[PDB]
Amino acid sequence: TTSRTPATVVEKLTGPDAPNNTWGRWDIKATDLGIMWDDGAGHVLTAFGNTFGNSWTGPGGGAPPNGNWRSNVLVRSSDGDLADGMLFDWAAQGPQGVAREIIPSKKINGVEITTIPTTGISVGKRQYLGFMSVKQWGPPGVWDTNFAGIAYSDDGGGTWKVSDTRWENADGHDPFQMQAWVQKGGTIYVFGTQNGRNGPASVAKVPASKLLDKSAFRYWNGTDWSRKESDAVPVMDAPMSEMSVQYDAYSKRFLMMTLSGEDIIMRTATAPEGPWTPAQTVASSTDYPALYGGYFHPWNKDGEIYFTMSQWNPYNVYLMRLRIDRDGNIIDPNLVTDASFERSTTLGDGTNGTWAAKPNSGIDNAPAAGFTGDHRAFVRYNSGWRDIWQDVAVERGAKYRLTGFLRTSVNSDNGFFGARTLDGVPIGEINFHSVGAWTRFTVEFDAGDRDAVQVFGGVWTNSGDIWMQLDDVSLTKVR
Amino acid sequence: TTSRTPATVVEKLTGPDAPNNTWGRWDIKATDLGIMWDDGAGHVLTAFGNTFGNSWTGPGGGAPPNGNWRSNVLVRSSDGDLADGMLFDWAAQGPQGVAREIIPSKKINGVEITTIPTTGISVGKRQYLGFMSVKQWGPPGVWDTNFAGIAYSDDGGGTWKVSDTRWENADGHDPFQMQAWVQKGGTIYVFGTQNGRNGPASVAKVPASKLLDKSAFRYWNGTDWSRKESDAVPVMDAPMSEMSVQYDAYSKRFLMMTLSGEDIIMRTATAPEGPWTPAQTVASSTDYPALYGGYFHPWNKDGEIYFTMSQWNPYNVYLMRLRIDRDGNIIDPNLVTDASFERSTTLGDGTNGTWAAKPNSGIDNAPAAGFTGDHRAFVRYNSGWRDIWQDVAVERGAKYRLTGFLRTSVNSDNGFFGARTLDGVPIGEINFHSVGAWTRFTVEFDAGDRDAVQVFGGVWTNSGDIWMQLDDVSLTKVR
Ligand SMILES: CC1(C)O[C@@H]2O[C@H](CO[C@H]3O[C@H](CO[C@H]4O[C@H](CO[C@H]5O[C@H](CO)[C@@H](O)[C@@H]5O)[C@@H](O)[C@@H]4O)[C@@H](O)[C@@H]3O)[C@@H](O)[C@@H]2O1
Ligand SMILES: CC1(C)O[C@@H]2O[C@H](CO[C@H]3O[C@H](CO[C@H]4O[C@H](CO[C@H]5O[C@H](CO)[C@@H](O)[C@@H]5O)[C@@H](O)[C@@H]4O)[C@@H](O)[C@@H]3O)[C@@H](O)[C@@H]2O1
Ligand SMILES: OC[C@H]1O[C@H](OC[C@H]2O[C@H](OC[C@H]3O[C@H](OC[C@H]4O[C@H](O)[C@@H](O)[C@@H]4O)[C@@H](O)[C@@H]3O)[C@@H](O)[C@@H]2O)[C@@H](O)[C@@H]1O
Ligand SMILES: [Ca+2]
Ligand SMILES: [Ca+2]
Ligand code: NA
Ligand code: NA
């Protein structure tokens, strides 16, 4: 939809330009999902779906025959400072220097083409990773699974076995093919969808210590929790996709994220069986085309909600953030209009929620041309100060955080990114020189005694033919 | 010298192709030294000299006018697993996304062209960083300093102040311009050289809590520790350079590392004042041209000696390792001859400590063409198995660790790195596909009942015009 996107892009976690350098360290050049859980020992484990190495070019998933296709890979983080990204400090390797597939697949189309992680959790000293055995793929949002399964590891994710526990997909409509686990107290709630993205979500619950025992599951049947899976009823209507569910102590609500139709949405509930509050836009397909996934970071707290988002054309995973109040309502949204430049192929005059720029400037538009999406802004010249800017309404006296991703021609020597008055006087800014990789810059400032500022990025071009590119600009209130 | 290099390259820590991606994270594209210390709070702080960003090309230090020249930068590590590299987890930034200069300099040639870190330590909750004020550079190994200073930080390296404590260099021959600190008991021993690389080392000591108080220093004069800096006599003869000293609990010895003439060497002592045992070669200029630095990692233990080494042409810092026994003798040296391919410009026949390869192959030779140095081996064809190999003498029944750095053309699909019998039967190997960045591969194997193996790397080349490059191959006994 054209709904506004409250969420902010924090970092590209995987693939080209990613700070993490998954490509260099582990031959993770392109991948998706980024399903996260707390390993019970001070770390976050993060699992990915179909992963490709050095020869991948994109756009999209898929690679040449030498693409080092693994159905899945796993990395670890110990990073508690998510505002500045999420550093991966380890990966399951084999050989060393290459992230290995941890849940094997046959890679025979129409039998089992791949095995894709869905959700993860730890109980005591055991890690568990839910997955789906994919028989074959159809058009977007459509695929067939053989079963949902569970792998486990007793050494923090170093080595894995596949358990015998499965939800078989007898008739293609089994409701627990694609799962999402949340633990509260001594109980794991297991949400499930059918294969693909056109069906509803169901829920079951199991004592945390009995996750591998299907007979210990009880299924919400609309009145109570019963033994038969075939009694399960939907708790959230179709259409729903891959899902993530987190218990947020701050708001005393379960939060659920999913791609529903076009957009990633969030709903909230005081109990897993519902009632689930109406969908709130997290990210729209207009701002983040061919987005999918959406998995909560397990160290979210205090109303700060970090999550991983996938996107088809760049075929890589981004860390995202949004904020909620104590009722689970999204607050302090990105106030920048058209933050990812995806909504227009030209510039405006900088007013009324449009971007402006000096000559020579425009929107580059091609598959995965953006930092995210297919669009980015540019400005280029060979004389004087050359910038890109947008007027943004603000609350006088409030403090703001401005983040954005930019890069320059190698011969760039002086650029700035920041906020200024509508008269052009800088309020807060930083100074960059030559920027190779897409790089996030971050500026926090007081809006002061005014109802609007101009967010901007630009380069001095006195020294030569110099360009800057820009994407995914966010202005959000600081609390 | 042409002496053999016992040390093994572990990882490139900074710059292009480094796993750490200091370039993308922090605009640390090229830099030197990598002076390390324990910050007292479970981390290693690492300081660097003159640092350049995105526009740097090399070879060597210096950059274009937009090269984001900083006199120094500082990163952090929490990494206890040095066998697979040293992950940096933070850098002192400003703006965020750019590692900043932490010790200012005037950058006026003949006054103060730069400020270079020399050594660091923590005492309680304070970090200290020694540095030299550089007035002007001369030819290699020669420069003039104004003084040695000490900067300090009370917030774990986040912010820095330059103290008023200085060793001034009125006549150019002050013996403590370039310091190396080591703490044992509550005493810091302060080793010192003149400016540049042609003089001897002296030693001073100070109670750890009084590092900033020059009146608390005592200076070894050959008979006792006295109050006057002018009484200090050499404890180690010229020529010596930048230095590192570590107290090794394993050997109950102080270890000293420095570039002495052409080679990085190590000496040992049971007391800081000496006597210092004769120089042992760590890395020779023949294998590692224009090497310098050599700083011990503070978490060295059990005889495993990790250290950082700089090298001019790639102008970046590498983690290295060697092993000692309980007497402080280097043991278990790299058994591969001409490990970095620098000693010859053409291939041999694989015997007598030479490299061989199948057509089309040779030694690439250009400034900073190596992973390290100017040389790397290459093999390239479009048919069959195409490899680079060397016969290496082994001890029957012993276990060995083979590491080496390689990369491939993007269209590579299947290569192997490992050890095999002289008759070509693999003993242990790994399988790689397409390798973009220089990447280290690691193989451990039993030599079994034989006293030679062939170490190799190669690519299958049926799928196209495929090449592999290879550098810094090491085979060392496992303990
Ligand atoms: C055919 C396909 C999907 O499977 C093969 O395996 C590789 C990719 O695998 C990753 O993709 C799976 C998810 O696939 C769904 O998501 C795609 C993108 O969705 C976004 O774009 C569409 C179009 O508007 C919207 O649905 C959404 O916003 C969609 O096309 C797929 O149905 C993961 O499970 C797996 O890890 C490729 O080599 C190849 O692609
Ligand atoms: C002029 C110089 C050195 O300083 C300017 O700032 C940048 C580089 O600075 C780093 O260089 C210093 C060390 O410089 C010495 O090391 C060089 C390399 O040594 C190897 O080559 C020679 C000959 O084989 C041997 O001494 C050794 O094996 C040598 O030329 C220098 O004297 C660090 O303190 C500093 O951070 C450049 O822009 C420029 O270079
Ligand atoms: O890949 C990086 C970006 O390149 C593409 O840039 C598109 C822009 O390039 C042209 O503008 C740059 C062009 O203008 C400047 O020179 C202009 C000359 O015109 C007058 O005669 C003189 O004042 C001046 O010398 C110089 O910087 C260069 O030649 C323009 O066609 C377009 O807007 C982007 O798509 C990428 O992001
Ligand atoms: Ca975009
Ligand atoms: Ca070399
Ligand atoms: Na972080
Ligand atoms: Na490591």
Coordinates of N, CA and C and ligand atoms in Angstrom, one line a residue, chain B residues 340 342 372 375 471, ligand 5:
Chain B
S340 N 55.4 -16.7 1.8 CA 54.7 -15.6 1.2 C 55.1 -15.4 -0.2
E342 N 57.8 -14.4 -1.6 CA 58.5 -13.2 -1.8 C 60.0 -13.5 -2.3
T372 N 50.1 -10.4 1.8 CA 51.2 -9.6 2.3 C 52.3 -9.5 1.2
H375 N 54.4 -10.4 -3.6 CA 54.3 -11.6 -4.4 C 53.2 -12.5 -3.8
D471 N 48.7 -17.1 -1.0 CA 49.7 -16.4 -0.2 C 49.8 -16.9 1.2
Ligands
CA5 CA 53.3 -12.6 -0.3

